[PDB]
Design a protein around this ligand. Structure first.
Ligand SMILES: Nc1ncnc2c1ncn2[C@@H]1O[C@H](COP(=O)(O)OP(=O)(O)OP(=O)(O)O)[C@@H](O)[C@H]1O
Ligand SMILES: [Mg+2]
Lengths: 240, 240, 238, 232, 209, 234, 239, 96, 250
């Protein structure tokens, strides 16, 4: 044996094992969903309540990399934070070099190449977080992208990462997301989150929602408290 | 057959072989795709297949074809991230050649420099030798079209018709039998042969939403991606 | 077990063992408690000594006028980090002429300690910092861990046999929203009294108290003026 | 980043370098080649055979001219041959930029062997896998040289390297002599390449280069077709 | 226990023979190399049997010779790999000090590669005295030439002082080799006396090849 | 079976530091007592051969005009630590113009302990942690001060310390003869009693060494003339 | 830049590389050194010459200065580099402080270098042990002994190399004030000590004597014969 | 269920092993074993047994009838420090 | 990174170190050369190894290299490393002449090269050098000199030396037959011929199988010569004739 020690040796069947171990490390995080609407995208995160001592709003899993791009993560928190920092630095460097907000199709590529640089040499280890990027522009539409530890960047109408990826994406696809605008999407997201993680696995949790689109002048931010109050009240009826 | 560290690093086996390179070649087949390239009398054509297992995935961002230069095109086989890295390297090298010498790069020199860059990896004991294979098509003045192929071990060569992927052997057999006819070649003939080769190897009888085609001709050297409409035209005209 | 020799390797279940080992090392220190009121934050530490004629080891350190920390682990790394804290706070004061908000500092610490857990042949830092501070948004209590992960808390206890104290904090959680310093510190000491066996308790030579508040700078009390706080405390029921 | 900084080839308990020997065993399995010289010029012959008809044999070569009067061929591994050729080109330019005179062959061989050996004592690498044959014509007397992964170099009158190379050595001994002609040299070299040639011999499966006291050249397919004719 | 170690050919076996000579207890001898076998679960059987028969008789002495051979060479007839050797070693290692009363048996073993065998085998309680055998010195070399040419009818022409400085570090066995070879080469011609040039060629024959 | 020098054990402790802690037990004993009157330090020498020059081997060496040091364990490497101590003290005096507390010097030295790092920098005092155990004795504005420093980097102020091979017995016996109303002479006498009791060989005026520091005069050590006074007066 | 730790602590607290270096030194040629009230004598044995060597290129006694001498046991590769560094330090000393260098100073310098060579990375410890003999100013002739681990001492007489135990045991039971009363007495003592060791039948001894006046005075192969003869006569008359 | 563990003796262990393995000796009545315990830092019960045996053998070596302190000191000097290049414990505390 | 290291610098439990030992065992085989000096002029004899019928036979030298106007050296072991070392010392001597405007003494040059060689076995983690070579020369301080080197780094001055595969017999027979300061460039040569005869198992001493180099002192030349193949066979037959007379006499 001994072929799975370093990230520089191929197995006889022809694949790298460390990256597979990393992906299995990802598959134990909580859960996160992101879907695109007519004119924007919506993220949604469920945060488990480990104990009563912590506060709400702690260890935010939603990061606003730039003034107009949002990020959601799943994996190890520290690696996620480091990647967020490098992405933010890349965006600012690009603005200074040229002079306008960076498009997604370039920022995602830069982050992907930088991540992929950590799977060749034996002096470092591969990362342990998988993340999602979203944004909207008035002249560019709504953009969603997903990136994994291996270094693959793909585009989605709507996707989900975490423990129950398959279960969630079963009900992601039923919705007609091609037309209906993302003002009623939020209720759908609350409903689709409350139908997973049974009470047997854990008792209580909390919910985070984000927002982007021309509905908020293209900026990316958090949803108001009353809106999520109404959405949660609505999703309370779906358990019937 | 081996003793010590022949199975972990790129060092010589007692029988004269070395395995860490022989493993990349079978690492090529992990994706499960195939591509074919044909050189005509005054045209060059490449055909590839794409697979989209689910509706959530945006079908417009899975193209394996990339545009290196206004006169040179490339097609990719193998893993994903390594492919992107090698593509970026090629683009950068061509741009530097243009800056330094002031005229366009011939296709052969570019392929040589990329393969030579690959060769260093199989010389040291820190890196992985990049398991993804490259196909290039272009037009050279006073020489007509030209088709070249580059492999992970560093062995580049110019062919007349090639296939890379899971089914290399039977496709090469079919192409050899066909090219033995020793006749003239035109655009329609090239495209028809290239389509039917893959069609019979996989035995699918497909639809116009599963195959991508790139061409170049000596009337307008600009590499271009065929629109779905004219792809359908070729496909229906082929079936008498 | 060959998966247990370096940071770089990944176990088949996806758990690096070096970080688990460092956490286990942090559980070796003496108990310590930290909690906050509406406008004050208090952290309490219980000391240790080897022979009856050796002085007790100190735990609480002084970082800056509005920032104090408590330590559990091995002391060399503790000093290595405190020097960094001092340097950054002084730099911020020198340049922008304003106190450094606590959360930004904590983020700096996280980013700093994350680096060694990724390169080759580098160990992690074994410390269990508890940060207590006051900012424009009020009091703040934070905790770090060797895995370069930090949490925001309103009442936390770490060290050997810190579990019973944490349960006690959980039980009496609400009343912190109305009490003042006099009873706040008495609650903290009540909490700390649970993590001791049935033979010895507080004697004013094993206790250290640090307080910061809206109008009071971070102050340390130890071995002398501590008697005012301790006296009037109900005995352990048996 | 950072390399490894410790050599991978060390003395065995019997005092034998294992790696260089394994490299030689790998070299022995390459394409055969032969080289001859007789009083008027030097001839190098080697065999090439593509696997299928799809390969365009007009795109790559085995015989590579370093300068107008120095020739190089190889036997063994594929890729690194190009690296060595590039280094030799560079060394030639560096020398010519000092004395304004073409390099004598012996100096070129010395420098190339120096590189090849130096490469086995550095950190974290493995040696090359090639055997080189060098030909030249300076100061009237023709010169032939053969290097080796170990770095040792020799001067040969006529030799053969590759598969079944011992039989080529014996045959050349039983045929080669000291006074001949270039044409007879070409014929006998082609004959000894046909000792274990492929199924059939054509004009494109054989690469031949010559160098006389007038210069070094690679022969076009026309004359190869003619020489293959009226032979065998 | 006693283990005797040192460079090759300096009289370990010889001292063993002498001890066997004078003694009164039964002497049992076995070389370490044939502890290995060609089937599974046989080595342990052999060792159990050996020590059983040893304690079956009487106060006795067991001699195990060239132990290092088990731990340095590999033979294809060995059906198991290198794990069965470990099994054998565990069995032998238990025989010396296991769950049961030993009785009255001594152990003597010898080797010339003591830096390869398992240090768990040598701990006090299984073997106590370790005795090292160094190379001969000029005084001892003189005594050795004196001993090995007793019943030799030799001519006074020879000078042993030349042969004492014959080699930088000649060992004990080279002495007996030189003596016997020179005797043979003089007896070639059916003669009784040996001359000096005879040694001059004999040492060259035996030391250089 | 090979690990780097920076590995954590399954129970949380480090490997190299634990081994060095076990290694400082191979050195000679040493006892230090602090009293409001002053501080006294006593050490053995372990003379092996009559050709020894007993005055050649020394343990107590001064760091400044008012700071003394006692060393146990290995010796060869401690020279670096002593040198850095002296240089730091003089640098501080040059820059600020006063005398430093033994505490500040103690931690200024202790920050140097954990530096071994296989990778990274240029030549470092790498490879291994130092193997010596140190007692620091000084007199500052707050009276006499005695500190103990350890290979792990931890320093603490003590009242009666014993370090070395026979440390346990000395520490065990020392508790029953100490209190806060102590005086210098009887302190030195009790220390000598303990040393002679745990000694290996015989006791004379050349097998041991003492040094004392009081607020009045500077660091001063006894020679073979005033040393036998307490020996005969035992 | 080969950077990897070599000397690492053992589980029970030893520096295994240092033990190995000491065990390597314990198998070299034998050297002895003693001091007197005016003359200090150091000698070496077991030359094992094959009557084809030029002695001026095989000698193992070299002069650091006009007043300091070395003897060493171990391996002969490293001796020259150690000696060269020491000479460079001695010369550099005078350009600063004018006075000639003391012997104890050079001993400390060598000891510190040898010790710091055990804390760096990718460097094996040194494998020599040496005796440094010199008569400094103020007339106090003295010798110092060096160890591979880096601990130096001031002695009265020592023997290093193969068979140190026997030579020592000889020395402590035969060195008294009367033995070093006269110069010929000291030379007789050293010759007697070396003779009671490895055979070296008269022609395999090399001695060096300082009379506290000038540089090296190597005795020619003449006084050795006379000293041996009178030693034999004294042995015959005593018994 | 239980994972009892046996470790190298500390200090009461060493003196007490000496008391046990030397209580059947004809030796001097005024020697102290605590010094002997101090002189051997990490050693097993086996070494103590062998020290007792070798001191007895040194006494029987010359002519004596009862052993003294010098025998013990010499025995410790030889079985501990002279044989220590054939010891397991530096390679069985990393548990392999 | 440590899982693939080999540790070409550590000691051993027994005290010695193995890399130079293996290097010595390898240097034991592969070649034969020896040197002798007794009067004005010193001789080196080298047994050729590459003697196949197909060699161009050029460059005038295959194991004898000039290093200065009066420095020559042979070599045994791995050839490429020998090229490295010769090139390295060449500019050492040139820089000495540059610094002092005076021909360099032999011993200083030998010591400098030996330091360079030993630096590899002190630290750095590389394989050592597998080369053993000789040195002959003349200088104003001590006249004619001969020297031998060693992969470990140690050297020494000698009068008769062999390094070949059967050097042991060469030493034994040179021990018993030598004369101090009398063997001029007429009697030492016959001894060398017969010594080489005993070393090589092949008899008849093929003229092409051996090479001889001589160094002589001249006022303004310092002649270094390599006598051709038209004068070796006469030496061979002269030795054969004298041995025939001695054989028939007894
Ligand atoms: N000191 C000696 N006195 C007498 N004979 C000796 C001495 N040393 C060696 N010999 C001779 O050398 C021979 C070889 O010794 P022996 O056969 O006992 O070898 P050994 O030490 O067991 O080594 P090995 O394992 O190489 O066989 C003996 O037969 C004896 O004749
Ligand atoms: Mg034997």
């Amino acid at each position: 044996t001994g072929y799975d020690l370093s990230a520089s040796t191929f197995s006889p069947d022809g694949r790298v094992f460390q990256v597979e171990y990393a992906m299995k490390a990802v598959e134990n995080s909580s859960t996160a969903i992101g879907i695109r609407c007519k004119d924007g995208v919506v993220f949604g995160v469920e945060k488990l309540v480990l104990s009563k001592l912590y506060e709400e709003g702690s260890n935010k899993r939603l990061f606003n990399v730039d003034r107009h791009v949002g990020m959601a993560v799943a994996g190890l928190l520290a690696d996620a934070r480091s990647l967020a920092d490098i992405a933010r630095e890349e965006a600012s460097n690009f603005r200074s070099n040229f002079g306008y907000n960076i498009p997604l199709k370039h920022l995602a590529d830069r982050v992907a190449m930088y991540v992929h640089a950590y799977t060749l040499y034996s002096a470092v280890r591969p990362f342990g977080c998988s993340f999602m990027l979203g944004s909207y522009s008035v002249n560019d539409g709504a953009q969603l992208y997903m990136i994994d530890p291996s270094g693959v960047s793909y585009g989605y109408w709507g996707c989900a990462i975490g423990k129950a990826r398959q279960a969630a994406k079963t009900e992601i696809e039923k919705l007609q997301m091609k037309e209906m605008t993302c003002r009623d999407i939020v209720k759908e997201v609350a409903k689709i989150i409350y139908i997973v993680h049974d009470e047997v696995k854990d008792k209580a949790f909390e919910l985070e929602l984000s927002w982007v689109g021309e509905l908020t002048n293209g900026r990316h931010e958090i949803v108001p408290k009353d809106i999520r109050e109404e959405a949660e009240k609505y999703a309370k009826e779906s358990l019937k | 057959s081996s003793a010590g560290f022949d199975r972990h690093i790129t060092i010589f086996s007692p029988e004269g072989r070395l395995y860490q390179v022989e493993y990349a070649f079978k690492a090529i087949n992990q994706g499960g795709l195939t591509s074919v390239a044909v050189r005509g009398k005054d045209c060059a054509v490449i055909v590839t297949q794409k697979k989209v297992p689910d509706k959530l995935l945006d079908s417009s961002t899975v193209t394996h074809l990339f545009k290196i230069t206004e006169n040179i095109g490339c097609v990719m086989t193998g893993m994903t991230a390594d492919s992107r890295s090698q593509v970026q390297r090629a683009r950068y090298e061509a741009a530097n050649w243009k800056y330094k010498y002031g005229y366009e790069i011939p296709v052969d020199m570019l392929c040589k420099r990329i393969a030579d860059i690959s060769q260093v990896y199989t010389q040291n004991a820190e890196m992985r030798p990049l398991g993804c294979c490259m196909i290039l098509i272009g037009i050279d003045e006073e020489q007509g079209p030209q088709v070249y192929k580059c492999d992970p071990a560093g062995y580049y060569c110019g062919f007349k018709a090639t296939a890379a992927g899971v089914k290399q052997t039977e496709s090469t057999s079919f192409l050899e039998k066909k090219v033995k006819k020793k006749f003239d070649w035109t655009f329609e003939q090239t495209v028809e042969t290239a389509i039917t080769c893959l069609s019979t190897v996989l035995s699918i009888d497909f639809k116009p939403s599963e195959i991508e085609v790139g061409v170049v001709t000596v009337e307008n050297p600009k590499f271009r991606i065929l629109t779905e409409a004219e792809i359908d035209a070729h496909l229906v005209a082929l079936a008498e | 077990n060959q998966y247990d020799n370096d940071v770089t390797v990944w176990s088949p279940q996806g758990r690096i063992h070096q970080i688990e080992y460092a956490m286990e090392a942090v559980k070796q220190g003496s108990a310590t408690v930290g909690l906050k009121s509406k406008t004050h934050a208090v952290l309490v530490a219980l000391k240790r000594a080897q022979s009856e004629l050796a002085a007790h080891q100190k735990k609480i350190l002084h970082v800056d006028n509005h920032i104090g920390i408590s330590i559990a682990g091995l002391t060399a790394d503790a000093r290595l980090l405190c020097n960094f804290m001092r340097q950054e706070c002084l730099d911020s004061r020198f340049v922008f002429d304003r106190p450094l908000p606590v959360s930004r500092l904590v983020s700096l610490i996280g980013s700093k300690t994350q680096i060694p857990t990724q390169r080759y042949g580098r160990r992690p830092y074994g410390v269990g910092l508890l940060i207590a501070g006051y900012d424009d948004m009020g009091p703040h209590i934070f905790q770090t861990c060797p895995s370069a992960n930090y949490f925001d808390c309103r009442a936390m206890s770490i060290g050997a046999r810190s579990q019973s104290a944490r349960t006690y904090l959980e039980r009496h959680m609400s009343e912190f929203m109305e009490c003042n310093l006099n009873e706040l510190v008495k609650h903290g000491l009540r909490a700390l009294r649970e993590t001791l066996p049935a033979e010895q308790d507080l004697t004013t030579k094993n206790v250290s108290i640090g307080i910061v508040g809206k109008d009071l700078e971070f102050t340390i009390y130890d071995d002398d003026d501590v008697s005012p706080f301790l006296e009037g405390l109900e005995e352990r029921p048996q | 980043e950072r390399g490894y900084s410790f050599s991978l080839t060390t003395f065995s308990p019997s005092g034998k370098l294992v790696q260089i020997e394994y490299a030689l065993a790998a070299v022995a399995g390459g394409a055969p080649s032969v080289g001859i010289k007789a009083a008027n010029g030097v001839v190098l012959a080697t065999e090439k055979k593509q696997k299928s008809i799809l390969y365009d044999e007009r795109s790559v070569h085995k015989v590579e001219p370093i300068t107008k009067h120095i020739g190089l061929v190889y036997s063994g591994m594929g890729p690194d041959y190009r690296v060595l050729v590039h280094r030799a080109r560079k060394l030639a330019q560096q020398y010519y930029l000092v004395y304004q005179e073409p390099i004598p062959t012996a100096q070129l061989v010395q420098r190339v062997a120096s590189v090849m050996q130096e490469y086995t004592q550095s950190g974290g690498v493995r040696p090359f896998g090639v055997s080189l044959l060098i030909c030249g014509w300076n100061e009237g007397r023709p010169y032939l040289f053969q290097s080796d992964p170990s770095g040792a170099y020799f001067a040969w009158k006529a030799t053969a390297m590759g598969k079944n190379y011992v039989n080529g050595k014996t045959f050349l001994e039983k045929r080669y002599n000291e006074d001949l002609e270039l044409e007879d040299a070409i014929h006998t070299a082609i004959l000894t390449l046909k000792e274990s040639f492929e199924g059939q011999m054509t004009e494109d499966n054989i690469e031949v280069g010559i160098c006389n006291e007038a210069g070094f050249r690679r022969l076009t397919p026309t004359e190869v077709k003619d020489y293959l004719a009226a032979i065998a | 226990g006693v283990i005797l170690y040192g460079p090759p050919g300096t009289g370990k076996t010889l001292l063993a023979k002498a001890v066997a000579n004078q003694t009164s207890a039964t002497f049992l001898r076995v070389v370490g190399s044939e502890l290995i076998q060609k089937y599974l679960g046989d080595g342990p059987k052999l060792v159990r049997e050996l020590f059983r028969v040893a304690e079956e008789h009487a106060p006795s002495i067991v001699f195990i010779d060239e132990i290092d051979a088990i731990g340095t060479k590999r033979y294809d007839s060995n059906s198991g790999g290198e794990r069965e050797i470990q099994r054998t070693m565990l069995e032998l290692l238990n025989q010396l000090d296991g769950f049961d009363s030993r009785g009255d048996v001594k152990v003597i073993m010898a080797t010339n590669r003591i830096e390869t065998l398992d240090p768990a085998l040598i701990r006090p309680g299984r073997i106590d005295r370790k005795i090292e055998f160094p190379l001969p010195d000029e005084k001892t070399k003189k005594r050795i030439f004196q001993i090995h040419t007793s019943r030799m009818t030799l001519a006074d022409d020879v000078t042993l002082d030349d042969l004492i400085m014959a080699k930088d570090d000649l060992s004990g066995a080279d002495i007996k080799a030189i003596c016997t070879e020179a005797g043979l080469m003089a007896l070639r011609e059916r003669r009784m006396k040996v001359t000096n040039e005879d040694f001059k060629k004999s040492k060259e024959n035996v030391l250089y090849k | 079976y090979d690990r780097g020098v920076n590995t954590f054990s399954p129970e949380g402790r480090l490997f190299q530091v634990e081994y060095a802690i076990e290694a400082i037990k191979l050195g000679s004993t040493a006892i230090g007592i602090q009293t409001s009157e002053g501080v006294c330090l006593a050490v053995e020498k372990r003379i092996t051969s009559p050709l020894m020059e007993p005055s050649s081997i020394e343990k107590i060496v001064e760091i400044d005009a008012h700071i003394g040091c006692a060393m146990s364990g290995l010796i060869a490497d401690a020279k670096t630590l002593i040198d850095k101590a002296r240089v730091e003290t003089q640098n501080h005096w040059f820059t600020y113009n006063e005398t430093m507390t033994v505490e500040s010097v103690t931690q200024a030295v202790s920050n140097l302990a954990l530096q071994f790092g296989e990778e990274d920098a240029d030549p470092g005092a790498m490879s291994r942690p130092f193997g010596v155990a140190l007692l620091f004795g000084g007199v500052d504005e707050k009276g006499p001060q005695l500190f103990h420093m350890d290979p792990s980097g931890t320093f603490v102020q003590c009242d009666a310390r014993a370090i070395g091979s026979a440390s346990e017995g000395a520490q065990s016996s020392l508790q029953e003869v100490y209190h806060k109303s102590m005086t210098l002479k009887e302190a030195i006498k009790s220390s000598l009693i303990i040393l002679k009791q745990v000694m290996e060989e015989k006791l004379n005026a050349t097998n041991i060494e003492l040094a004392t520091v009081q607020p009045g005069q500077n660091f001063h050590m006894f020679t073979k003339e005033e040393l036998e006074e307490v020996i005969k007066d035992i | 830049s080969y950077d990897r730790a070599i000397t690492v602590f053992s589980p029970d607290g030893h520096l295994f590389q240092v033990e190995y270096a000491q065990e390597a030194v314990k198998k070299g040629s034998t050297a002895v050194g003693v001091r007197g009230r005016d003359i200090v004598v150091l000698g070496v044995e077991k030359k094992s010459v094959a009557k084809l060597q030029d002695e001026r290129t095989v000698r193992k006694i070299c002069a650091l200065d006009d007043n300091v001498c070395m003897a060493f046991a171990g391996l002969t590769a490293d001796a020259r580099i150690v000696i060269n560094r020491a000479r460079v330090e001695c010369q550099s000393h005078r350009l600063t402080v004018e006075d000639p260098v003391t012997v104890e100073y050079i001993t400390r310098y060598i000891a510190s270098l040898k010790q710091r060579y055990t804390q760096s990375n990718g460097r094996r410890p040194f494998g020599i042990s040496a005796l440094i003999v010199g008569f400094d100013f103020d007339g106090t002739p003295r010798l110092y002994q060096t160890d591979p681990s880096g601990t130096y001492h001031a002695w009265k007489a020592n023997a290093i190399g193969r068979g140190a135990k026997s030579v020592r045991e000889f020395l402590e039971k035969n060195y008294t004030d009367e033995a070093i009363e006269t110069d010929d007495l000291t030379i007789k003592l050293v010759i007697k000590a070396l003779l009671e060791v490895v055979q070296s039948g008269g022609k395999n001894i090399e001695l060096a004597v300082m009379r506290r006046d000038q540089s090296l005075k190597i005795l020619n192969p003449e006084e050795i014969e006379k000293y041996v003869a009178e030693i034999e006569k004294e042995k015959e008359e005593n018994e | 269920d239980r994972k009892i563990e046996f470790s190298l003796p500390d200090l009461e262990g060493r003196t007490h092993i000496f008391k046990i393995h030397a209580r059947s000796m004809s030796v001097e009545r005024d020697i102290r074993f605590e010094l002997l315990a101090r002189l051997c830092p990490n050693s097993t019960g086996a070494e103590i047994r062998s020290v007792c045996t070798e001191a007895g053998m040194f006494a029987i070596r010359a002519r004596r009838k009862i052993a003294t302190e010098k025998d013990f000191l010499e025995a410790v000097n030889k079985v501990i420090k002279s044989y220590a290049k054939f010891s397991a414990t530096p390679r069985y505390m990393t548990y392999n | 990174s440590r899982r693939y290291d080999s540790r070409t610098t550590i000691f051993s439990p027994e005290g010695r170190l193995y890399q130079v030992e293996y290097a010595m065992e390898a240097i034991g085989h592969a070649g034969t050369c020896l040197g002798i000096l007794a009067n004005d002029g010193v001789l080196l004899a080298a047994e050729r190894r590459n003697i196949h019928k197909l060699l161009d036979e050029v460059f005038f030298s295959e194991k004898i290299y000039k290093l200065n106007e009066d420095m020559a050296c042979s070599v045994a072991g791995i050839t490429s490393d020998a090229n490295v070392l010769t090139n390295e010392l060449r500019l050492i001597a040139q820089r000495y002449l540059l610094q002092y405007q005076e021909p360099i003494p032999c011993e200083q040059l030998v010591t400098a090269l030996c330091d360079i060689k030993q630096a590899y076995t002190q630290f750095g983690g590389k394989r050592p050098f597998g080369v053993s070579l000789l040195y002959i020369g003349w200088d104003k301080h001590y006249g004619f000199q001969l020297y031998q080197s060693d992969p470990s780094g140690n050297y020494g001055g000698w009068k008769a030396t062999c390094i070949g595969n059967n050097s042991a017999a060469a030493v034994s027979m040179l021990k018993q037959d030598y004369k101090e300061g009398e063997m001029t460039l007429k009697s030492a040569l016959a001894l060398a011929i017969k010594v080489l005869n005993k070393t090589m198992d092949v008899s008849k001493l093929s003229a092409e199988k051996v090479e001889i180099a001589t160094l002589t002192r001249e006022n303004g030349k310092t002649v270094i010569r390599v006598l051709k193949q038209k004068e070796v066979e006469q030496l061979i037959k002269k030795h054969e004739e004298e041995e025939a007379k001695a054989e028939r006499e007894k």
